[PDB]
């Protein structure tokens, strides 16, 4: 509802491999506390096309910048894979 559970879309080789061939699959990063239903609701209120299904990924924090004078940890990411129906392809940028 508040639509703070859609932080940033991410574009990688896996993402672009999916974003072709009839059904498109768009991968965003979402609030780690959000649920699948909240992700679908956010997509409903801000895009307008009902996802066919939603898959979720949790990327665990790991050590980064190892050996550097001050080492630091990573940030917890939850990934969401929206899949729109046949024949529909909306743009992530431009509204």
């Amino acid at each position: 509802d508040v639509t703070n559970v859609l932080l940033k879309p991410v574009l990688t080789e896996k993402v672009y491999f999916n974003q072709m061939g009839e059904t498109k699959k768009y991968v965003f990063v979402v609030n780690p506390k959000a649920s699948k239903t909240r992700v679908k609701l956010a997509f409903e209120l801000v895009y307008g096309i009902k996802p066919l299904k939603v898959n979720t990924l949790i990327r665990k924090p790991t050590t980064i910048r190892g050996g550097s004078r001050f080492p630091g940890l990573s940030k917890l990411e939850k990934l969401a894979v929206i899949t729109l129906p046949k024949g529909i392809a909306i743009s992530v940028t431009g509204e």
Binding site: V10, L11, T12, E13, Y16
Partner: peptide, 30 residues
């Protein structure tokens, strides 16, 4: 031609060389 020249190296954030997008190479490195 020009798009062939602009696909060599110049690796984008999430990618490597070779499979550079055929149409999207003017956004990050503009």
């Amino acid at each position: 031609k020009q798009t062939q020249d602009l696909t060599k190296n110049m690796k984008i954030k999430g990618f490597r060389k070779g499979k550079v997008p055929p149409t999207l190479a003017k956004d990050y490195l503009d």
